[PDB]
Amino acid sequence: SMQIFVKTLTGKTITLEVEPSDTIENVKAKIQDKEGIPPDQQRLIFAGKQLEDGRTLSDYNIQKESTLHLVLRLRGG
């Protein structure tokens, strides 16, 4: 189990405790638990690409103290 960082576009960095086997959806769930953002609003980006829900941190070779980036979807009505 390791720390990773999620940097927002608002000057905030979220620190998470994860494992390399955690899927991206698990990561989004952790963000919901800690920060209150529904997973369906989250888009995570690492090394220039958007991460797919089904795949794992280790798949994208995300290691410890790596920084992912959070961009929110926008939905209006």
């Binding site: 927002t8 576009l9 608002t10 000057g11 905030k12 920060e35 209150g36 953002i37 529904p38 609003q41 888009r43 980006i45 690409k49 958007q50 980036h69 959070l70 961009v71 929110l72 979807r73 926008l74 939905r75 209006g76 009505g77």
Partner: protein, 189 residues
Amino acid sequence: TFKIHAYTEGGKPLRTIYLPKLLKKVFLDVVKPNTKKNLETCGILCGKLRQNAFFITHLVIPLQEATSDTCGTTDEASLFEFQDKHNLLTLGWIHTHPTQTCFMSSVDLHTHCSYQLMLPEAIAIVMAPSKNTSGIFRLLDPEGLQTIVKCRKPGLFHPHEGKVYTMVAQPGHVREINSKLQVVDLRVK
């Protein structure tokens, strides 16, 4: 160093956001073709933090889709590429209600909650051009944010108990000024 002129309901300080007074009009101009076709359009308010205040400097129109009643981004990676490479903060968002009154809908509140959790000062501008009205809104903090975070009600549009949101304080939270504005429309047609 700029000072604090506004507070949340819980007493937390809100840094000033300086909003170009032309932004609202420019947004309506830029999205006029959609408004004419009775389609909503959204935009991101982007800017910088300088000496304890925020400055909105860019209006970004992201890749998106819409109906008469909804709008939504479809390529956030594209939006991220712009904000990341230009180093611009997300300070809030704007959208049209082409035919409706000026208010924050269920979708608006669920969306804005996340932006405001990530930046306490985050604002939502709503344009209602058929009414010639507009508003700048935020959720009540902490109570409104708490309600929306806890909400699991079904329906794309559902009501919420009591007051969840408010108009922002002006000029204390948002002050409209004569300042530079760049438009960045990322759409491909």
